[PDB]
């Protein structure tokens, strides 16, 4: 079988409409999808999906960046391409001139990681498996081979990625057995959005919890009385016994950063996510060394391996966020989570988007598998929109993430969402654009 | 006056095909310009030109991120935006929705510094005046409304900006008489790209030192044994007192480089620009402090002022590259060029790439006037190719920079050179791709 087509869609959502994921930097996303397939000549199942993660304007920007691919993939052998995603990532990562517009950063690299994504979810689709099994029973060698360890000989050899990789094959059965018994852990960020009133805000907190949850996210950054009042709040809704961490999006320079945090650590901070923008790992260390030991977190942003290494490398994290879109797909994230790994260092997946939980569940079950066998001490971030539109939607139960089970990354979309929510020609826009 | 257009144009240079550009990371670059006009509805003359600059794939992707911009600009008036090019520049890097393409990174931050550059080329045109002028003798006070403050108040804050600016102002306009009757120092690395034959290389660097260059640069970073080769004939064709860099591309890791200089140091090195990956400040300064006292540089692709900030407070320089078209517009490079003040560290400016020595001359040149007061011990990058498609190409006397005259940015292109080498469609690209 061959690669017949890439086909792109610039698919957005009105998250807006109600302020769903709202924050202090992002004060009205409408959470969209620069969605991608890979096409082949085969059954209607043999195809890649996967997407890009953006709030609106800019999606038709980063769709377009993603179908300037095409001339990379159409044309390749499946068998080729699924045997060595390696080489299949290498040759869109290695292009010097798509290199230029980024390097490994930005909308260019992001569309790469897209395309890169829809590969893994067609060889996990041709391997009758879902992806988190798909990785995680890949033998030692053939993960390493996916890795692009340029840029971290000095903190992740690939001796080094195969030893943590062999050091856990005694124990994947065991470890793939008591994930699909129990699931993983979540928390949920939907109750915390900053433009949800006060009311809103109590009341999901109230269900987050109920529904199971340990952990709750909330939306700080604009104005400390606001978050105050609010981390107070929830803090009495939830109970001493739940964990309530806040999300400032970037908006704080560090000395700004660590006096408000001072004021909100009295209502028991889980962490504080993002407090300064996502390229400064040594302001991130200075927020963290200034108001230690509450703990601080980034990753949602963090462009690739090299800058996460740097976080690591210089302590200015106390767990990390991946991202299953940001990044150059699945090949950088293994190497962030060895990396993270090595420097034993918590990893709680980013899913605050479209279709995020779909694609990152994959990620952090893989690693507790073939990497770090730990999930009971971090979790997987879960927001309650937009799963209907997906074929595999994710399943939480009493706050835990079921295993999925069907083949593939879980990214394909119904044909009836993209056909009503495509921008700008789509059944709701034309309506709501008029 | 109103801007009533913002066109842009995907024009790409054959440069591969005699390799003129080519490196380690970038074998056979085509330098191309994502061409943008703000078009105005005032004199032919008022109009505002600006490129990002690509080296083939992925321009038409970069080209369409700048046409996205033009709802936040057509509508606006003149004088509104040429009056506050600081609330012009945020009105598109704070939209909260282009920022997650980013944030200030990739194809969507070079495609907003593009149209912030072509702003200002607009204003210096109101003014009548070449942009290095404009901007040297905007007040203080209207200098610093300019900037983005956010993220620097720990390395430098508007106050400590005036106090730079404030400080530099009795001598403006001397400095402005000693630039125009002297010109502004520069080296070239035409002599130098890694496609070239030995011959080649050898014969291009006696005509550079002939033509009053007293500093050349070298691509290095594939081959160990060729660098050496390369660096011993260059630096006997040269002779023992013309300065000699070289530029690895971003192509080593920490340990590798540390080794690979080690090589190269009995050849008298200037610098060596960007040993490895641009996002990796702690990596610089570990090689930085492996190879000392050989200089480190890098710039030329660090995506933003923040970035910049901390190779600074990292000490992973000894000099730092900016670039027109890498970040924000002047907005940023401003900024950037007042860290380095502040920070004591030497400004080589970057333009390797078309276009890039008639933009960033005027911002190392405004640098001078208005900042610095230095040029003597350092130098404009400069590049021997496609200035004959430029309506004000720049102007080298004995190895030094002409001061620019006409008014603008020095952006602005020919049509003709626009019909013929527009991709796909332009004359060459057509007859070429036949
Ligand atoms: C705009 C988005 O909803 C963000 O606020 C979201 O990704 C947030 O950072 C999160 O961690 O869930
Ligand atoms: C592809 C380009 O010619 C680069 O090699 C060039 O920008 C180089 O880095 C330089 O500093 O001139
Ligand atoms: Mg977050
Ligand atoms: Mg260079």
């Given at each position: 079988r061959t690669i017949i087509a890439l086909e792109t869609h610039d698919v957005r959502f009105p998250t807006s409409r109600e302020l769903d994921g709202s924050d202090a930097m992002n004060p009205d996303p409408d959470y969209s999808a620069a969605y991608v397939v890979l096409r082949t000549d085969g059954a209607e199942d043999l195809a890649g999906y996967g997407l890009v993660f953006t709030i609106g304007r800019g999606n038709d920007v980063q769709?377009?960046?993603?179908?300037?691919?095409?001339?990379?993939?159409?044309?390749?052998?499946?068998?080729?391409?699924?045997?060595?995603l390696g080489a299949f990532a290498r040759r869109l990562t290695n292009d010097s001139q798509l290199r230029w517009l980024g390097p490994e950063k930005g909308v260019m690299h992001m569309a790469i990681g897209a395309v890169?994504?829809?590969?893994?979810?067609?060889?996990?689709?041709?391997?009758?498996?879902?992806?988190?099994?798909?990785?995680?029973?890949?033998?030692?060698?053939?993960?390493?081979?996916?890795?692009?360890?340029?840029?971290?000989?000095?903190?992740?050899t690939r001796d080094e990625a195969l030893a943590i990789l062999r050091d856990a094959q005694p124990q994947r059965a065991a470890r793939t057995a008591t994930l699909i018994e129990q699931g993983?852990?979540?928390?949920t960020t939907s109750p915390g959005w900053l433009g949800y009133s006060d009311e809103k805000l109590v009341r999901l907190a109230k269900e987050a919890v109920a529904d199971g949850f340990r952990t709750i996210k909330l939306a700080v950054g604009a104005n400390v009385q606001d978050d105050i009042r609010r981390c107070?709040?929830?803090?009495?809704?939830?109970?001493?016994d739940i964990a309530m961490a806040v999300d400032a999006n970037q908006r704080w320079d560090?000395?700004?950063?660590?006096?408000?945090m001072r004021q909100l650590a009295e209502f028991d901070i889980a962490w504080i996510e993002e407090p300064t923008s996502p390229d400064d790992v040594l302001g991130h260390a200075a927020i963290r060394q200034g108001?230690?030991?509450?703990?601080?977190?980034?990753?949602?942003?963090?462009?690739?391996?090299?800058?996460?290494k740097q976080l690591l490398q210089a302590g200015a994290v106390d767990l990390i966020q991946i991202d299953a879109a940001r990044v150059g797909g699945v090949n950088e994230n293994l190497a962030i989570l060895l990396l993270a790994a090595k420097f034993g260092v918590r990893v709680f997946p980013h899913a605050g988007?479209?279709?995020?939980?779909?694609?990152?569940?994959?990620?952090?079950?893989?690693?507790?598998?073939?990497?770090?066998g730990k999930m009971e001490d971090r979790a997987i971030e879960f927001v309650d929109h937009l799963h209907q539109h997906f074929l595999d939607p994710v399943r939480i139960q009493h706050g835990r993430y079921l295993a999925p089970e069907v083949p593939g990354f879980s990214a394909e979309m119904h044909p009836?969402?993209?056909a009503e929510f495509s921008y700008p020609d789509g059944r709701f826009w034309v309506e709501d654009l008029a």
């Open positions: 769709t377009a960046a993603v179908a300037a691919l095409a001339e990379h993939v159409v044309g390749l052998s499946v068998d080729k391409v699924i045997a060595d890169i994504n829809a590969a893994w979810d067609l060889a996990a689709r041709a391997a009758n498996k879902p992806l988190w099994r798909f990785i995680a029973e890949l033998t030692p060698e053939q993960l390493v081979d996916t890795i692009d360890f340029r840029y971290l000989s000095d903190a992740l993983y852990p979540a928390y107070r709040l929830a803090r009495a809704a939830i109970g001493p560090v000395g700004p950063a660590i006096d408000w108001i230690t030991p509450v703990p601080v977190s980034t990753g949602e942003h963090t462009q690739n391996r090299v800058v996460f988007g479209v279709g995020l939980c779909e694609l990152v569940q994959h990620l952090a079950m893989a690693d507790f598998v073939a990497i770090t009836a969402s993209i």
